[PDB]
Enzyme design. Structure first.
Site, mmCIF file in Angstrom:
data_model
loop_
_atom_site.group_PDB
_atom_site.id
_atom_site.type_symbol
_atom_site.label_atom_id
_atom_site.label_comp_id
_atom_site.label_asym_id
_atom_site.label_seq_id
_atom_site.Cartn_x
_atom_site.Cartn_y
_atom_site.Cartn_z
ATOM 1 N N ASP A 67 0.799 -1.207 0.000
ATOM 2 C CA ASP A 67 0.000 0.000 0.000
ATOM 3 C C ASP A 67 0.836 1.263 0.000
ATOM 4 O O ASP A 67 2.001 1.265 0.392
ATOM 5 C CB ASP A 67 -0.957 -0.002 1.196
ATOM 6 C CG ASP A 67 -2.182 0.856 0.962
ATOM 7 O OD1 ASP A 67 -2.166 1.652 0.001
ATOM 8 O OD2 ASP A 67 -3.159 0.736 1.730
ATOM 9 N N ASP A 109 -11.025 2.284 -2.731
ATOM 10 C CA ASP A 109 -11.391 2.218 -1.321
ATOM 11 C C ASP A 109 -12.907 2.280 -1.169
ATOM 12 O O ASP A 109 -13.459 1.835 -0.164
ATOM 13 C CB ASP A 109 -10.726 3.345 -0.526
ATOM 14 C CG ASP A 109 -9.316 2.994 -0.085
ATOM 15 O OD1 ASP A 109 -8.954 1.799 -0.139
ATOM 16 O OD2 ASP A 109 -8.575 3.911 0.330
#
EC number: 3.2.1.22
Lengths: 718, 718, 143, 146
Positions: free
Chosen positions: B469, B539
């Site tokens: 990430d 997301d």
């Protein structure tokens, strides 16, 4: 800590936010107060980094700004950028102080809209500053009392002890809270300048720009944010006109959160500017106009402002002479007798000015030589410019002269003497355009030379008119008199030099009407308008082609500066055959003149000219200084129509155009604008109509066959 | 003189003009030959200057080019720009030699599409050079055999004895003869990435770009020229995909003569690169795709190429595990006992992989600390990663781990020990996004440390899955290990470091399936796909929101890499309530997974989930590796529809969605694509239909109420 | 409207061709032009009146109009192009064709041999021309 | 009697109807169109050929409306003003690609070419002799062929 600018019926609101930040708030119709630049819960936007680490809501990426930078958490295209000696491009401007004074200042070495009295405008100077590197940027805001005009420019000053290198230095940047607009710019080419192009905004980057060292035929230094439903007669329009004649960047950026950043100024591309400690840099200004009264209203604001407060000289408020240019008659091959002989004929028709075009100087017989050598050819003009002008004067005509002072022919006395005086770079082939090179106006010796050379020549004869021309765009941009670190300053320095040359030359000769030119309207920008009160609109002199060209040019620039000449047919640019009647009406919708061989005209045509000249002299003041309304757009259909209305609205001139004939066509009608509805007007030859009827109901158009028709009506209050 | 690249059913043609000039002529559907005998002479274009003074008909401003420069008579935005030591920016590349070899070369320090056999592609290298400064530029062209793919990149090398500074170095540039196209790019933001935006072209410059050091949520590195009438199922489309994960510029410029210059590469803004004598610079590659099959045809070309010849590793052709991420279940607060007994239920539901998210390392109780300190928290995991992974394994699940190696928290062991290891500039405040800084990957020591630290952590346990990430964008871009004249190389050097870091780490662990992530699809680009065979799409996990996102993502990227997980309701991003059945169907349209607290689920819901998991396993190879067709667009209306077709067309899966219910609505119908018309299909639960009927006539859709509905159909050939 | 006799012919030859003008009022050049026109139409008559018709550019959608006739075996073709309003310093023009055999080469009379697929997928460059209301006619034969 | 003819060589379907009075009372044809067809959807553009003397058959393309659209003639002749032809065109269809549904009337007098979109998005394309100012009386034993 709120700055509230009041220009005409418009408001421009800014505010100091947090620790010395300058935030944009509002621009539009005038308001007494903006209460709401205070209370608003700010959001934690994902991937929008924070100058103050503990507050995730505050980010320069999400702040509407006036002069933003990049790298300080803002990821949008910045208004400026400067590289430090350590290599970094990070800078942080904070509020320092500000001052308010009535009137408007002069921009150093630059043209700018001016005032004759303090009361005409108020100026807000917001001084920002980066304490670390000692970079001080002063933001200049001026609000005109009479118009919806806000002008913006910036002044850099290195008050530190290090070298500052300006990678980008735009005149302005403004962040609109929303992005639901269309945008208008003025693209084109040689022979077809400033076509109106309406487009919807994209999420990303859109721009109109010039890398040619000139404002260009390709892109005019003007963009505009317009409302989705806005047209010529109504709607909100935001205009951005750049006062500069060189390279420019006019850009609109729409981000992830639907904000639109309008920025404008000198094109950052191939541009740098070194700032030694103590040095300053002044950016040209951008004239901003707001209008809720449509495109016409925006244009009308520009028209008054630019005609009365940008254009200068003795001819600013004066009616412009109807001229004839005999280039098509003799080309380069002429003499004193042949010119004076045809001058009599033209003078009999009612023409007021005769202009001597290219070929009078040196050995100029082609376009391959003699540029730079400005001396009278004694073969063609034995009695010199003075002898020719004198003869023309006693014929009743004013005299004019053509010059191209920025240019030097490789085959000229000037170039074989000063080969380093042209724009060039070491050991590279010197590219040409129309077999000529560009003189280095970044150099002091060159400028002073041109200033002396042109002035003395222009003072040697009773010359009352000058056509200043340029037929090339820059290649191999560089200067021998500059150090390597200042090489990318060449283009802007050239333009600064050109501005000084024009300022000094025009000042020496106050009795000379100067007309700017650049292969037509290749330099039709506000910057040139400051030095020369009128401009040659386009080399495309076709009546039909001029419909679009003059329509688009009129969007920004006043009619008084829009040169339009009746030419011969078949048209040399398109090959179109339009009636002399139509060619006249189009040319009469601007700064009227002629460009054709009179010796080639039929006797019927020459009679039409006399009637034309007589007609335009009656409507000249109304055309050049009146209010201009556009009615029918040639970009939107088969028609073209506009009208000129006097200040007291007692007088009007209506022009209508249809281009392609239709068999068994529908009945045509036309509605007017700008008239007094409570008053009656007599349409000459037609009858008397009520102003309300003319605007609300409209007039019936006559049925006409044949291609490319034109029509003019004189309106007078009863 | 004439180069003719033949890729699939497409042709890309170039031709050497005069002395060394390289001209573009044609790119589109494959022809046997493009006639070299040019139809009609060149024109003398006004204000378009000439490299050869004798021939006014030649101008680089009017030449269609492959790798143009500025200042040499071309006024359009160049593909590259180099600043010499003397300050000039004028360069002149002429043809030297060229070579042709089977296969496709690797790009130095850069990811690239590859071949496994020499027969799969031909590569043309055109060596251009500027003899004066000794600058050599090799244009790299690669044409695949089975696809319409043409890849382009450039390679600079300094063969002179001077410093050469690359101000601009784009991967490619191409001049279309006409500009009558619309253009599609993928603007967006966090929570809504890659929205399809179709716009008409403007006369000037349009561009999608990133200045964030990452490819960004805001603009995906992909633009396309599409025909005015081209849609999903027909028409000509020209795709441009940048294989890079940092800053980029994707620009389209329409000039005065109606030509369209498409350029792409590393964003020239805030970018320079210094080339010492003997040094070279390799650009990332751009994958160019043509299709007259429409948008679906273009996407399908990208899908196969990217999945089979861009993605790598053991998992390239392998079915991806149905995972679950336990973020909402525990947050930063978790332990061994809580995970394993919860993972026991998850295994019984059919889940194949349990992923441990943020919080397993250092002092992680917040998002305001501990990034950079990658050691197991003995307080939460007493037996460490090794113990947890093995205990997870014996329940029958793979074990995954979340990492963010590119980030360092100001409050961390690493930062207190190495505060100069982050991206920073001298004497400026260090801005923070999500309370964290960016590590300087331009440095070798920083990279080397991460490679060792991460690999050792990843080797300490049977970890077969990694979520890599990044949750920040670069600010104050600079390096303490770079000289002032190389400071603007920091952004690219960072990306080179990251690429090199991933390359070694993924190589050390070939048993690991890597999934890239950046606050969602912050870096969903071809560049990342080369290292990590799948990506976290967004997301935002809302079923309705995912309709637009996944539809737009599928335009370029294969479904196999498109991560989609079922989440809780009301949704955390928008607050919308959709059915669990709907969220499944949307998620099963991509890389299926889960992100929710299973303990909060009702008993009825757990059974839905077990059937969802079991169903996806049946359709997985079809979904992830089949042919993808977009049927109805959520950007164009209230509906969203797509389908997956097996290679032999014997099996298909159709997904339909309708957002806002209409009372008393008209009957709904759906026409399919990509089926065998000469064959009959049985729709499970409905009956047998002909392939021709489904495509030409369509299926009557069931009348349904309620908002956010979904339908899925398995199709089987008889 | 005034249009060239050349243009008036090219439009009329696009349909059932005839004449509606006074020959006693024609110049020798115009009468010689008419004779050339008649000889041309008789060559492409069977192709025009009985061949397959393709509309290329619409006069309802822009400043251009173009259409072509293709024979049954696609060995022969007539391409007609029209441009009404002249643009100064105009962009370069191109035309894409339809209904040709991709696998064959065609000789455009007085221009050279182009591939069928090239004419349909790439297109042919158009001559730069001025004046209002212009026309161009090409005969195509397979090799 | 509804008449349908399908050509083997072309995508041509021709339609007409034949009325016959087999009863014992007068039947008055107020309207007798040649055909009518209900499309399941109405997402289309339509093309008719309006014009006038000296400018016949200009191609006019328009989006469909919820209601009625019709090109017709009341002039006893097919007319310069409206040509007896309408076409349903797919939204993205052009000269070279896309689904098109043409409707051509083989008749030289008054015509009605109508397209009606209802509440449920179905499109009814009906075409034939203009019902306006038109009746036809059928005595027992009489017939009418459209």
């Amino acid at each position: 800590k709120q700055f509230h600018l009041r220009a005409g019926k418009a408001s421009y609101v800014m505010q100091l936010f947090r620790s010395g930040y300058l935030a944009h708030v509002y621009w539009g119709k005038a308001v007494r107060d903006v209460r709401g630049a205070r209370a608003f819960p700010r959001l934690d936007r994902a991937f929008s980094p924070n100058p103050d680490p503990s507050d995730r809501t505050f980010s320069l990426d999400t702040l509407l700004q006036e002069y933003p930078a990049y790298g300080n958490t803002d990821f949008r295209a910045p208004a400026y950028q400067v590289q430090l000696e350590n290599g970094s491009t990070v800078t942080d401007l904070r509020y320092k102080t500000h001052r308010i004074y009535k009137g408007k200042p002069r921009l150093n070495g630059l043209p700018a809209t001016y005032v004759e009295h303090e009361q005409e405008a108020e100026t807000l100077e917001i001084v920002l500053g980066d304490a670390l590197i000692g970079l001080e940027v002063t933001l200049q805001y001026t609000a005109y009392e009479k118009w919806n005009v806000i002008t913006r420019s910036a002044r850099f000053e290195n008050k530190g002890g290090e070298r500052l290198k300006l990678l980008r230095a735009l005149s302005m940047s403004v962040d609109f809270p929303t992005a639901d607009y269309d945008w208008i710019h003025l693209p084109g080419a040689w022979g077809r300048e400033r076509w109106i192009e309406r487009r919807p905004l994209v999420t990303g980057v859109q721009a109109a720009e010039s890398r040619r060292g000139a404002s260009s035929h390709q892109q005019n230094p003007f963009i505009a944010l317009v409302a989705k439903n806005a047209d010529e007669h109504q709607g909100e329009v935001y205009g951005f006109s750049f006062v500069y004649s060189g390279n420019f960047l006019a850009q609109i950026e729409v981000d992830q959160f639907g904000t639109a950043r309008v920025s404008m100024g000198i094109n950052p591309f191939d541009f740098t500017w070194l700032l030694q400690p103590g040095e300053s840099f002044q950016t040209p200004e951008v004239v901003m106009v707001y209008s809720d009264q449509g495109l016409n209203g925006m244009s009308q604001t520009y028209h008054e402002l630019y005609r009365t407060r940008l254009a200068r000289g003795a001819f600013r408020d004066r009616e412009r002479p109807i001229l004839i240019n005999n280039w098509e008659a003799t080309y380069f091959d002429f003499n004193e007798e042949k010119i004076v002989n045809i001058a009599r004929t033209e003078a009999e028709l009612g023409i007021e000015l005769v202009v001597l075009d290219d070929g009078w100087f040196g050995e100029r017989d082609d376009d391959r030589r003699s540029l730079g050598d400005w001396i009278v050819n004694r073969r063609k003009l034995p009695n010199g410019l003075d002898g020719l002008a004198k003869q023309v004067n006693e014929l009743g005509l004013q005299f004019g002269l053509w010059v191209e002072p920025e240019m030097v022919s490789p085959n000229s006395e000037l170039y074989r003497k000063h080969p380093d005086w042209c724009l060039h770079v070491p050991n590279r082939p010197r590219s040409e355009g129309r077999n000529q090179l560009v003189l280095d106006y970044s150099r002091e010796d060159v400028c002073d030379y041109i200033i002396e050379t042109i002035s003395n020549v222009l003072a040697s004869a009773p010359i009352t008119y000058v056509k200043w021309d340029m037929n090339r765009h820059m290649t191999e941009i560089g200067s021998s008199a500059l150090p390597p670190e200042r090489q990318r300053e060449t283009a802007h320095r050239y333009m600064l030099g050109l501005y000084r040359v024009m300022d000094e030359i025009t000042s020496r000769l106050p009795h000379i009407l100067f007309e700017s030119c650049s292969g037509g309207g290749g330099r039709f920008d506000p910057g040139m308008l400051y030095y020369m009160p009128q401009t040659w609109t386009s080399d495309n002199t076709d009546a039909v082609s001029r419909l679009k060209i003059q329509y688009g040019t009129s969007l920004v620039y006043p009619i008084s500066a829009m040169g339009a000449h009746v030419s011969a047919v078949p048209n040399h640019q398109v090959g179109r055959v339009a009636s002399l009647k139509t060619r006249g009406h189009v040319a009469m919708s601007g700064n009227f003149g002629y460009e054709l061989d009179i010796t080639k005209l039929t006797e019927t045509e020459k009679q039409m000219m006399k009637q034309q000249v007589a007609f335009y002299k009656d409507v000249r003041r109304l055309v050049q200084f009146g209010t201009f309304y556009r009615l029918l757009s040639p970009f939107e259909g088969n028609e073209a129509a506009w009208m000129f209305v006097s200040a007291d609205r007692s007088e009007a001139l209506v022009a209508y155009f249809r281009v392609l004939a239709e068999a068994n066509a529908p009945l045509s009608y036309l509605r007017l604008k700008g008239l007094d509805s409570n008053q009656d007007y007599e349409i000459e030859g037609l009858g008397v109509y009520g102003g309300d009827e003319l605007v609300y109901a409209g007039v019936a158009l006559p049925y006409r066959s044949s291609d490319f028709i034109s029509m003019m009506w004189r309106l007078k209050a009863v």
